[PDB]
Design an enzyme around this catalytic site. Structure first.
Site, PDB file in Angstrom:
ATOM      1  N   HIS A   1       0.852  -1.181   0.000  1.00 58.23           N
ATOM      2  CA  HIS A   1       0.000   0.000   0.000  1.00 58.23           C
ATOM      3  C   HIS A   1       0.896   1.242   0.000  1.00 58.23           C
ATOM      4  O   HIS A   1       1.101   1.868  -1.048  1.00 58.23           O
ATOM      5  CB  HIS A   1      -0.915   0.033   1.225  1.00 58.23           C
ATOM      6  CG  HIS A   1      -1.803   1.239   1.275  1.00 58.23           C
ATOM      7  ND1 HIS A   1      -2.001   1.942   2.438  1.00 58.23           N
ATOM      8  CD2 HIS A   1      -2.499   1.830   0.268  1.00 58.23           C
ATOM      9  CE1 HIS A   1      -2.807   2.937   2.123  1.00 58.23           C
ATOM     10  NE2 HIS A   1      -3.141   2.914   0.818  1.00 58.23           N
TER      11      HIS A   1
ATOM     12  N   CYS B   1      -0.385   0.590   9.551  1.00 62.95           N
ATOM     13  CA  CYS B   1      -0.589   1.876   8.897  1.00 62.95           C
ATOM     14  C   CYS B   1      -1.962   2.170   8.330  1.00 62.95           C
ATOM     15  O   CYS B   1      -2.520   3.229   8.616  1.00 62.95           O
ATOM     16  CB  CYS B   1       0.529   2.146   7.891  1.00 62.95           C
ATOM     17  SG  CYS B   1       2.115   2.300   8.772  1.00 62.95           S
ATOM     18  N   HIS B   2      -2.517   1.270   7.524  1.00 66.70           N
ATOM     19  CA  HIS B   2      -3.853   1.515   6.978  1.00 66.70           C
ATOM     20  C   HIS B   2      -4.782   0.291   6.993  1.00 66.70           C
ATOM     21  O   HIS B   2      -5.800   0.253   6.288  1.00 66.70           O
ATOM     22  CB  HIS B   2      -3.771   2.140   5.580  1.00 66.70           C
ATOM     23  CG  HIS B   2      -2.888   3.350   5.509  1.00 66.70           C
ATOM     24  ND1 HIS B   2      -1.526   3.233   5.391  1.00 66.70           N
ATOM     25  CD2 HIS B   2      -3.212   4.655   5.673  1.00 66.70           C
ATOM     26  CE1 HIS B   2      -1.047   4.458   5.493  1.00 66.70           C
ATOM     27  NE2 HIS B   2      -2.024   5.355   5.665  1.00 66.70           N
ATOM     28  N   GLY B   3      -4.433  -0.704   7.811  1.00 63.31           N
ATOM     29  CA  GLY B   3      -5.255  -1.898   7.951  1.00 63.31           C
ATOM     30  C   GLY B   3      -5.265  -2.953   6.857  1.00 63.31           C
ATOM     31  O   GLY B   3      -6.337  -3.393   6.432  1.00 63.31           O
TER      32      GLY B   3
ATOM     33  N   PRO C   1      -6.387  -1.666   1.858  1.00 61.49           N
ATOM     34  CA  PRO C   1      -6.017  -0.894   0.670  1.00 61.49           C
ATOM     35  C   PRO C   1      -4.826  -1.388  -0.165  1.00 61.49           C
ATOM     36  O   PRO C   1      -4.686  -0.978  -1.317  1.00 61.49           O
ATOM     37  CB  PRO C   1      -5.817   0.509   1.232  1.00 61.49           C
ATOM     38  CG  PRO C   1      -5.302   0.242   2.604  1.00 61.49           C
ATOM     39  CD  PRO C   1      -6.179  -0.880   3.086  1.00 61.49           C
TER      40      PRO C   1
END
Ligand SMILES: CCCCCCCCCCCCCCCCCC(=O)OC[C@H](COP(=O)(O)OCCN)OC(=O)CCCCCCCCCCCCC
Ligand code: HEM
Ligand SMILES: C/C=C(C)/C=C/C=C/[C@H](OC)[C@@H](C)[C@@H](OC)[C@@H](C)CCc1oc2c(O)c(OC)cc(OC)c2c(=O)c1C
Ligand code: FES
Lengths: 127, 199, 330, 74, 107, 123, 50
Positions: free
Chosen positions: F69, F88-90, F103
């Site tokens: 990502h 960081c963003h799952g 993501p």
């Protein structure tokens, strides 16, 4: 979870064709491995029949390469076996199995089907 | 996130330095050093703290000079280019127990004991967290918790599984001023000293 | 700026430099205050219609300054080289890997190597020093555009019939807020220096470990939440950047015939929905990517964009007609 | 002199709230050991632990001991 | 067609002792040999692959020594019961071939 | 280039080593893990890839620990798929390092490597 | 060393020249110091330690 479900006529008259079907669920035939057919003769003795890769490549045992036809149906996710002109020697319990391939460990059959006992007999059975 | 993953919330102890008008308790700092030297120093470094910074805070000039002179430091090589050692001085930094990271992991089953110069500011909870970790080791992990050989259970640590075993035990240190050296008394003293190291 | 010396050099300022902790705490907390005051400055604008004609150039330069300030603050945070610094640098530079074809090339160029390393921290310090002077120059352009039209007022109408000199009146009124600003900032600098920060940044950057406790600086959370709300990489970065650019649309979507919300019930209400929705977006930002929060963030993100593109134009049109039929007798 | 914190915790483990809390945990600890004795426990993936019960208890003790402990220290 | 011959073809033992079966091929196979367990109820699972690698779910009490042409399958006990015929196959090249089988009855 | 002593790495444990400034993840997978890896339906993967195309030896999963990502390093033995979780963003990765949720658009990239007795050489 | 390549020597010639010198390597798993043959990324070693 991956599963192999076998079905088909468990009794074929000598000279006729054997038609077995292996239904795979939880995984895709086209995804990537090898889909085999193997038989256990009456008296414990295993023999590898052949397979069909995820692409469609057929690799049979030269002992039966002139009679068998391992096809598949991507839309139904299942492969088949067809042994033409059977003899009483063809009597055995047939098993379908997935064989995975890794470049270091080679081949290994990890998922076996329930098994279907087929018997070459002139005996009559209700279709 | 599950409670285990988060870690148990460290409670609010009444630190004497807490509060706008409050300084540190320099007696507690002086004791914390002793605890750090006799119990923590064998695994933890204090790299950002220089000897001279102790003078006039928790020890006298002569006291720090003596402590410093107990360690060997590299000196400028002799007339033939041969390496030679020297005793420590006030301008040197407090030395760590290991020469490098590889050695540090070897002495602690793979884990790396972090430096403690900023540990108070480098953790949510600050003093409360440090003190709670040092005094919060149960004797046995809660039922059903599988502890990977080499680990120790501590609820305040995220995940509950910490590579540092409980090291503080009653009277393991003999305080100069004769203060009852209990486990919590020692945790309160190191933590106060560690807060000073960080601030 | 050396990656091997950065963190320690900030510690050297913190311990060895006379009054050095005051410099750092002022600089660090000063950054947050800079953003809080800027958010209020922008909010003030939305509310009183400071973005509309003849002040659009004024507003557009402002949006430019906002972006520059954010980039500056980002570069600054990277110079400490704590755990948050490293990973922030990695994520943010990687934001550009979304550009098709040349994507990964730009990242490699920004890094000056295989990953965020020495070349990156050193150039980031050089650029951190440079941008603030660019901002100063833009501030001059900002003041130039403000000057030809002058300030607006809370009534939203012409101020030409009653003006008072800047000197004494506003010089001394500004002094009031200057001292208040300094009083509050001093409270943090001396009594709560690290409340607005992150403990993880007190740990030297480690290229092999992203802490599970990683969270962006508070002033970037709302934008971060917007990015996380999109389950697609590219669309995620575009939406986040569009969140800043959509501020440029306000001059055209505000269909109202009067400037400001002072006398507008519906606009005043929806304005606060916007403010608290922004705050909520920030709160979602600090939470983990988990069930209730993910949906809340997606809906809040939608509300954020709907405000500029749907709410403002619908509400302003409706109010135009309300002011008319509510008195005109025909 | 014995550890002051250990004393305070012991005192509060004996209040009504404390006893109910240790009971809740202990009730959990039993259910767990019995679960470990059952055939085929190792392959469950849905194994129970008593961290939640333990946290509820430790939280109660902390809330009581935290404001008192330092008055008992030098 | 490579041929395998297991030994001792059909053995017996009591619940407890460590039994040791073994295969042998005509040609030299690297370590490309897999072992299969065949329960009396017609069920067949994979036990060991590539000489020593254990398949998912098979107990640690299953060893797999060997190289070149000689191979083995050691155990430790039979609890509850590992009463079934054990086979072995190769796969360096086609066609693949299995062993004669080795029943493990308890008496 | 860089070497790693696989003889040391115990059973179901992870080892992170540095190679070209990027982290390299190496796991000694357990039999159950190897099965879980090759028993997943492709249709449940945004980036379809068999475990076999990702590992030369089922026992050793070797990959770059860079979330596809935005670059963060995934935490080991975390997430909802028995693999890795990026904080960081799952983004969740499975026991084969494949992208399962979040993501990230691609599976953790497999670097070039070769075996050599009791040790492996990445690079 | 790598700067000699393509200027006065081939990749092989420089690689061989560099490998005749020792340099401090990363310490072993136990933390003890270890040496290694030089590589193209190294600098031509000097005759004196100080
Ligand atoms: C990229 C996007 C940028 C935009 C982001 C916006 C972020 C929000 C900014 C934070 C602070 C919000 C500031 C509020 C905006 C300006 C408020 C304002 O101007 O209110 C004027 C109002 C009454 O004023 P009138 O001029 O209409 O009175 C006429 C009398 N006849 O007086 C009032 O309404 C009363 C004052 C209201 C106080 C504001 C409370 C909200 C506080 C947020 C808390 C922050 C949480 C950390
Ligand atoms: C009272 C003296 C000590 C103090 C104040 C202390 C404090 C700490 C603290 C605050 C941490 C950080 C935990 C975290 O990351 O949140 C820690 C970690 C650690 N300590 Fe200590 N410690 C002490 C003594 C020791 C000793 C003597 C050893 C070596 C036997 C040791 C080995 C470690 C190790 C290996 C860790 C790693 C924890 C992990 O990440 O799992 N400590 N210590
Ligand atoms: C040479 C100069 C360069 C390359 C400048 C680049 C500038 C880019 C943008 O500025 C305009 C950018 C900073 C701005 O995006 C609009 C911010 C709102 C980005 C917000 C932001 O922050 C994070 C952060 O701070 C972190 O810290 C630990 C960690 C983060 O993830 C875990 C993030 C993150 O996921 C995002 C989206
Ligand atoms: S970096 Fe891993 S999910 Fe964004």
């Amino acid at each position: 979870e991956v599963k192999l479900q076998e079905s088909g006529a468990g009794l074929v008259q000598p000279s006729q064709s054997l038609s077995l079907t292996c239904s795979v669920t939880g995984y895709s035939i086209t995804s990537g491995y090898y889909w085999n057919w193997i038989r256990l003769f009456p008296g414990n003795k295993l023999e590898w029949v052949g397979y069909i890769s995820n692409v469609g490549d057929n690799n049979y045992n030269p002992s039966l390469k002139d009679r068998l036809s391992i096809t598949r149906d991507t839309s139904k996710n299942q492969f088949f076996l067809k042994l033409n002109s059977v003899t009483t020697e063809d009597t055995a319990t047939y098993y379908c199995a997935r064989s995975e391939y890794y470049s270091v460990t080679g081949y290994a059959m990890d998922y076996w089907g329930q098994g279907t006992t087929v018997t070459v007999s002139s005996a009559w059975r209700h279709p | 996130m599950t409670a285990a993953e988060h870690g148990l919330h460290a409670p609010a102890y009444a630190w004497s330095h807490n509060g706008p008008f409050e300084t540190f308790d320099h007696a507690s700092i002086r004791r914390g050093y002793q605890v750090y030297r006799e119990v923590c120093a064998a695994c933890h470094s204090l790299d950002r703290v220089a000897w001279r910074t102790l003078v006039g805070v928790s020890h006298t000039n002569e006291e720090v000079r003596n402590m410093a002179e107990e360690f060997e430091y590299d000196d400028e090589p002799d007339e033939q280019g041969n390496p030679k050692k020297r005793p420590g001085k006030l301008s040197d930094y407090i030395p760590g127990p290991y020469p490098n990271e590889q050695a540090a992991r070897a002495a602690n089953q793979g884990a790396l004991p972090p430096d403690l110069s900023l540990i108070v500011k480098a953790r949510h909870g600050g003093c409360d967290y440090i003190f709670s970790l040092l005094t919060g080791y149960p004797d046995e992990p809660p039922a059903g918790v599988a502890l990977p050989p080499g680990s120790n259970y501590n609820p305040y640590f995220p995940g509950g599984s910490i590579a540092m075993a409980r090291v503080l035990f009653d009277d393991m240190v003999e305080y100069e001023d004769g203060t009852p050296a209990t486990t919590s008394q020692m945790a309160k003293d190191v933590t106060t000293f560690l807060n000073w190291c960080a601030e | 700026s050396n990656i091997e010396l950065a963190f320690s050099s900030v510690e050297h300022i913190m311990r060895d430099v006379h009054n050095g902790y005051i410099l750092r705490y002022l600089h660090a907390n000063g950054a947050s205050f800079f953003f809080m005051v800027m958010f209020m400055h922008m909010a003030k604008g939305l509310y009183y219609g400071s973005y509309r004609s003849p002040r659009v150039t004024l507003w557009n330069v402002g949006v430019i300054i906002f972006i520059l300030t954010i980039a500056t603050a980002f570069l600054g945070y990277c110079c400490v080289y704590g755990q948050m610094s490293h990973w922030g640098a990695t994520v943010i530079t990687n934001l550009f890997s979304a550009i098709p074809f040349v994507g990964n090339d730009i990242v490699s160029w920004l890094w000056g190597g295989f990953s965020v390393s020495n070349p990156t921290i050193q150039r980031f310090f050089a650029l951190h020093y440079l941008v603030p002077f660019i901002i100063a120059a833009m501030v001059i352009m900002h003041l130039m555009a403000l000057h030809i039209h002058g300030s607006s007022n809370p009534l939203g109408i012409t101020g030409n019939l009653d003006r008072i000199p800047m000197h004494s009146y506003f010089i001394f009124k500004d002094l009031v807020t200057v001292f208040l600003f300094m009083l509050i900032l001093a409270l943090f600098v001396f009594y709560s220096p690290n409340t607005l920060g992150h403990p993880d940044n007190y740990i030297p950057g480690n290229p092999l470990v992203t802490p599970a406790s990683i969270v962006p600086e508070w002033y970037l959370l709302p934008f971060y939440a917007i990015l996380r709300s999109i389950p697609d990489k590219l669309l995620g970065v575009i939406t986040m950047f569009a969140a800043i650019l959509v501020l440029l649309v306000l001059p055209f979507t505000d269909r109202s015939v009067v400037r400001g919300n002072t006398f507008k019930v519906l606009s005043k209400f929806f304005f606060f929905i916007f403010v608290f929705n922004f705050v909520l977006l920030g709160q979602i930002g600090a939470c983990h990517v988990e069930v209730p929060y993910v949906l809340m963030g997606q809906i809040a993100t939608f509300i954020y964009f709907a405000y500029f593109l749907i709410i403002v134009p619908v509400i302003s049109t409706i109010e135009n007609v309300l002011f008319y039929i509510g008195r005109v007798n025909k | 002199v014995t550890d002051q914190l250990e004393d305070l915790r012991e005192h509060f483990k004996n209040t009504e709230e404390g006893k109910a809390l240790v009971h809740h945990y202990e009730e959990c600890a039993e259910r767990v050991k019995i679960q470990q004795q059952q055939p085929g426990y190792a392959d469950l993936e849905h194994k129970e632990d008593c961290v939640e019960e333990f946290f509820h208890l430790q939280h109660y003790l902390d809330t009581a001991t935290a404001p008192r402990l330092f008055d008992k220290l030098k | 067609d490579i041929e395998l011959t297991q030994t001792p073809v059909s053995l017996a033992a009591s619940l407890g002792d460590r039994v040791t079966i073994s295969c042998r091929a005509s040609q030299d196979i690297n370590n490309f040999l897999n072992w299969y367990q065949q329960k009396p109820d017609g069920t067949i699972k994979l036990l060991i692959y590539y000489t020593s690698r254990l398949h998912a779910g098979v107990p640690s009490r299953f060893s797999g020594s060997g190289s070149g042409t000689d191979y083995s399958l050691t155990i430790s006990n039979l609890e509850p019961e590992d009463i079934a015929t054990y086979f072995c196959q190769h796969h360096i090249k086609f066609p693949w071939t299995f062993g004669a089988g080795t029943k493990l009855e308890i008496k | 280039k860089v070497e790693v002593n696989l003889a040391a790495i115990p059973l179901g444990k992870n080892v992170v080593v540095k190679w070209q400034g990027k982290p390299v993840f190496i796991r000694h997978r357990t039999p159950h893990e190897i099965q879980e890896a090759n028993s997943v339906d492709m249709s449940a993967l945004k980036d379809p890839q068999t475990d076999a195309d990702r590992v030369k030896d089922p026992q050793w999963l070797i990959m770059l620990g860079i979330c596809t990502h935005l670059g963060c390093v995934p935490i080991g033995e975390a997430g909802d798929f028995g693999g890795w979780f990026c904080p960081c963003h799952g983004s969740h990765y499975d026991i084969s390092g494949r992208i399962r949720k979040g993501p990230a658009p691609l599976n953790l990239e497999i670097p070039a490597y070769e075996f050599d007795g009791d040790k492996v050489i990445v690079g």
